[PDB]
Design goal:
By secondary structure, the chain is largely without helices or strands. The radius of gyration is 6 Å and the shape is globular. It has no helices and no strands. This is Benenodin family lasso peptide. It comes from Asticcacaulis benevestitus DSM 16100 = ATCC BAA-896.
Length: 19
C-alpha cells in the first residue's frame, strides 16, 4: 500500500507502486 499501480503486498491500501 505505497503509491499506486498494482495491489499492495503488505497491507490493504487498494494499490502500490512496483518493486
Amino acid at each position: 500500500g505505497v503509491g499506486f499501480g498494482r495491489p499492495d503486498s503488505i497491507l490493504t491500501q487498494e494499490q502500490a507502486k512496483p518493486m
